[PDB]
């Protein structure tokens with residue numbers, strides 16, 4: 001028993017982190033087989049970054065313009081291309097530690113692990129969720145561009161995030177490994193706002209189930225609600241609507257606890273309307289929405 | 304961004320193995336040519352109720368122990384018991400052994416746990432050792448022998464190996480020399496921990512982290528002595544500070560220019576008067592599982 005924000009083990013990704021430098025600009029890259037993936041703004045000077053014409057800047061670069069270091073070894077760049085906001089550097093050497101991998105595009109509300117890494121050296125690992133407004137609430141500092149987010153299924157690493165930006169509000173933005181931003185953001189040195197965020201309702205409900213599984217029931221009540229009537233109140237509070245698919249994904253948690261989903265929904269509605277008084281749930285004073293149903297089932301199955 | 308962060312787990316993943324005796328299986332830690340694991344692996348379920356470990360071990364030979372890295376067996380060639388830990392000498396030195404140390408941590412100290420089932424790592428998360436010598440972890444059946452660690456430079460400091468889940472759902476275990484943290488024993492019995500307290504040095508670290516981020520409404524105009532602060536803190540079920548606690552706050556004190564005892568006086572007012580409906584770092588709750596090193600780490604990007 002117990003419930004904790006948990007990341008996937010990071011070793012398979014650690015073996016792929018390298019450092020990429022062009023001019024006086026340095027960030028992290030991801031070394032898979034004989035290709036190194038990194039944010040394309042590594043080719044910019046401070047002056048270029050305000051309004052970079054990336055295709056124009058890239059064609060003026062030569063392979064020798066790129067310094068790639070994998071620990072204490074320099075990797076020789078023998079080719080370069082760019083796919084949207086991701087620069088791809090061909091090197092003459094295959095990474096022997098390349099895991100089985102895929103590139104995927106994650107959906108809002110799904111979680112992933114981030115390997116924090118600076119100058120190509122891994123520093124920490126933590127779990128994030130893709131927000132409905134396509135931002136991430138992460139812990140990226142200077143030099144964190146090129147950090148990647150991932151999930152691991154069996155032995156396959158599914159890369160879903162590359163880090164590019166910190167917004168003025170302190171949340172973060174980035175791309176998939178195809179170089180497409182999540183959300184309406186652009187890799188230029190400007191202050192950018194996100195759309196209004198919303199709360200990931202299916203994840204709050206999963207987390208309430210985890211709290212019940214771990215002996216926390218104070219927020220339950222004897223009431224039920226219809227799905228529509230729940231969604232009416234949820235939307236009033238800037239919660240995402242709960243779909244029937246979401247209801248279905250929560251089935252196993254409902255079965256384990258014997259609490260119907262719409263019964264939990266009635267609990268959540270009362271919590272939104274009354275607050276938590278001074279009380280906590282799983283040690284939190286706020287309703288947590290960055291655990292998916294799968295995240296909860298993985299830590300609570302059997303308990 | 305300020306959030307809980309585990310260390311990268313790869314150096315430890317390469318050291319996880321499975322240890323089985325009969326049908327009893329758990330996890331072990333493979334460093335050089337020795338595997339470390341909880342000694343109750345030698346017990347049947349019924350043996351675990353009231354074990355005499357010295358007697359149970361005399362009956363065991365090297366050939367009764369199955370150690371597997373993945374599906375690959377590592378032949379056991381020696382065995383000995385050290386407190387609550389079994390040490391199995393194996394015929395292969397782990398080529399992935401990192402630079403490592405065995406350390407015994409203080410309450411309040413944090414560490415990463417590599418969750419691991421059947422010798423296969425499944426996740427990593429950050430834990431704090433509570434003042435009552437429990438940890439609020441996430442441990443299912445088959446998690447015994449999971450380890451807790453910190454990584455400084457390229458050296459892994461192992462501090463915890465998992466044994467037990469208490470009735471209340473918190474967790475208990477040993478250091479890597481087999482000595483339990485707290486007054487627990489490795490027997491199949493319901494055991495209770497002392498009443499827990501709040502980790503004062505970590506609350507202070509978090510207040511420094513708030514100040515570093517420009518959130519400083521709670522800075523008051525008073526100071527205090529260490530002794531007067533400790534006596535008042537205990538009335539709020541906060542841990543007394545030690546001299547080591549004062550010392551490890553030093554860098555955060557210097558970074559902000561706020562003397563440690565002035566921060567103590569500020570915390571004391573927060574305890575006596577509450578938050579008055581205000582938050583710190585976006586929380587009405589005073590957080591106590593970030594150490595001074597965690598705050599310096601996750602504000603400066605220390606890598607390993």
Ligand SMILES: *[C@@](O)(CO)[C@H](C[C@@H]1CCNC1=O)NC(=O)[C@H](CC(C)C)NC(=O)c1cc2c(OC)cccc2[nH]1
Pocket residue numbers: 026027041049140141142143144145146164165166167168172186187188189190191192
């Ligand atoms: C990368 O490490 C740079 O290579 C860096 C990551 C952030 C720095 C601090 N925390 C981070 O997550 N990213 C940037 O510096 C990006 C670079 C762009 C994509 C070329 N820019 C920003 O993060 C950025 C610029 C501005 C800004 O300007 C003007 C105004 C306000 C916010 C802001 N963020």
Ligand SMILES: *[C@@](O)(CO)[C@H](C[C@@H]1CCNC1=O)NC(=O)[C@H](CC(C)C)NC(=O)c1cc2c(OC)cccc2[nH]1
Pocket residue numbers: 001328329343351442443444445446447448466467468469470474488489490491492493494
């Ligand atoms: C190990 O995996 C066993 O090798 C296991 C880990 C726990 C099971 C579920 N979550 C865990 O953290 N540990 C145990 O089963 C230990 C075995 C001892 C050390 C021999 N025992 C307990 O965790 C334990 C026993 C009892 C108990 O008895 C009766 C009554 C109440 C609680 C309790 N916990």
